Design a protein around this ligand. Structure first.
Ligand SMILES: [O-][O-]
Ligand SMILES: [Cu+2]
Ligand SMILES: [Cu+2]
Ligand SMILES: [Cu+2]
Ligand SMILES: [Cu+2]
Length: 505
């Protein structure tokens, strides 16, 4: 296996606009197949990248900056990863659409799975409206990220390399003096399995496989043998002995991480998916499911000279291997100080979401379920509905709902709602066997309110097995056609995703 900590951590460049004025900022980004070396000891890997880069260029915008991005497909007409044709029923093979995750966007710029387009917009999906997306960014400073969202192809196009970071800077937060500029670094974490020849491996069927399975066949979960950060396998980052801010993004298909420092050092969490937490939280470890973001400070001041491993204790299809997936990256506190550390780690960060007193318009009960297809494969379904079934989640614009999410399955699902961020109310254990037999919900314990890390704003939330998770969300400010889904991509694609219509009176 590949030797750990031999390649420096890439810092993706910040995308420069094609045009900028005070009224409008305009970007162009083209998807391209390119080759990049993922580790010192590998031949170059064929990848799909935004502007040919893996990860894509980081986009940085200010709150309320009026942004337009033309996302273009200039990819080959055939995929290099195995497509299963039985999960979705003349269309081009390679379909793409870019979703700004966490973006508060009008619906035709949200990256709807059926708003896909093929090379040069030659063919477009039934919900396609526009080539140039509009991102008004009228929302909290936060770590967002952008990735492919094409119908039935999300797991594949994302795995191929179509991910990048998008940061919203709110200038009212500058007074906090959080580490910034060179000392503010994204960490996009993707697990990959890589063949001896340097080519990406993605399974063309489950391990067995039953001879009843089609070929290729979707798999219910993907666990990579190798961890990459910012497009390099187990990299190292030389840091100065001072405070850094890291924007940590789980851009993996299935894998959840549980991160800690191997020298016992602390993270200071200052932000979640939806932006700054009300109060900073000192943490020794944290769980990060697909699509979750953690905005953290790590203070290297006391650690000069040390090599510190960002470690992982969460299994994926088995226990972590100390030699491989137990490692994420390594910090090396050996970079000379460029200047005095003038940054801060404030306790008081932002308003509490609980300052809001919205009326509960509706209480929606949703269950995570599924069935088995004609081939014997598990099909995961929200409320035992298919993606293609008539829409049932129809919140009214401007109103607030509590969603009660019932999870009788054996694993955690990271549930994501497009458009909004939401509050976490609580989680509560229940009798699974009784719920499965009768559909009656019988609690086995009191409600557990969220920990401090979940007292701010979230857009992707871990719903553990045997629990009812309650969240509260205000559906706006736009009305239109959005989505909610599990963000384990292998679940999302078959078929754990549902439209969400935010309606006008
Ligand atoms: O958003 O996936
Ligand atoms: Cu996403
Ligand atoms: Cu999203
Ligand atoms: Cu799931
Ligand atoms: Cu989505």
């Amino acid at each position: 296996t590949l030797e750990k900590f031999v390649d420096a951590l890439p810092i993706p460049d910040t995308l420069k606009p094609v045009q900028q004025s005070k009224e409008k900022t305009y970007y162009e980004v083209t998807m391209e197949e390119c080759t990049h070396q993922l580790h010192r000891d590998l031949p170059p890997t064929r990848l799909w990248g935004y502007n040919g880069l893996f990860p894509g260029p980081t986009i940085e915008v200010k709150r309320n900056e009026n942004v337009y991005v033309k996302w273009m497909n200039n990819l080959p007409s055939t995929h290099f990863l195995p497509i299963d044709h039985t999960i979705h029923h003349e269309e081009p093979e390679v379909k793409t659409v870019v979703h700004l995750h966490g973006g508060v966007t009008p619906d035709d710029s949200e990256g709807y799975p059926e708003a896909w387009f093929s090379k040069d917009f030659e063919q477009t999906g039934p919900y396609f409206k526009r080539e140039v997306y509009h991102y008004p960014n009228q929302q909290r400073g936060a770590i967002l990220w952008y990735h492919d969202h094409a119908m039935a192809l999300t797991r594949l196009n994302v795995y191929a390399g179509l991910v990048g970071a998008y940061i919203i800077h709110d200038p009212k937060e500058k007074r906090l003096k959080l580490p910034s500029d060179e000392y503010d670094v994204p960490l996009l974490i993707t697990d990959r399995t890589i063949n001896e020849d340097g080519s990406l491996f993605y399974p063309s069927a489950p391990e067995n496989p039953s001879p009843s399975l089609p070929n290729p066949s979707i798999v219910p979960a993907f666990c990579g043998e190798t961890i990459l950060v910012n497009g390099k396998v187990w990299p190292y980052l030389e840091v100065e002995p001072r405070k850094y801010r890291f924007r940590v993004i789980n851009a993996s298909n299935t894998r959840t991480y549980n991160l800690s420092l191997d020298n016992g050092g602390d993270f200071i969490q200052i932000g979640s998916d939806g932006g700054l937490l009300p109060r900073s939280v000192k943490l020794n470890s944290f769980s990060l499911a697909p699509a979750e973001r953690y905005d953290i400070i790590i203070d290297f001041t006391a650690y000069e000279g040390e090599s510190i491993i960002l470690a992982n204790s969460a299994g994926c299809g088995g226990d972590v291997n100390p030699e491989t997936d137990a490692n994420i990256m390594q910090f090396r506190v050996t970079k000379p100080l460029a200047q005095k550390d003038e940054s801060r780690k404030p306790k008081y960060l932002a308003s509490y979401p609980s300052v809001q007193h919205e009326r509960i318009q509706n209480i929606r009960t949703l269950k995570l379920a599924g069935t088995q297809d004609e081939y014997g494969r598990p099909v995961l379904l929200l409320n035992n509905k298919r993606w293609h079934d008539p829409v049932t989640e129809t919140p009214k614009v401007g109103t607030t709902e509590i969603w009660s999410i019932i999870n009788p399955t054996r694993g955690t699902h990271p549930i994501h709602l497009h458009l909004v961020s939401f509050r976490v109310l609580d989680r509560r254990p229940f009798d699974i066997a009784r719920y499965q037999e009768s559909g009656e919900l019988s609690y086995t314990g009191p409600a557990v309110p969220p920990p401090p890390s979940e007292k701010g704003w979230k857009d992707t939330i871990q719903a553990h097995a045997g629990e009812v998770l309650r969240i509260a969300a205000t559906f706006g400010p736009y009305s239109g056609r959005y989505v909610w889904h599990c963000h384990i991509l292998e679940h999302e694609d078959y078929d754990m995703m549902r439209p969400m219509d935010i309606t006008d009176p």
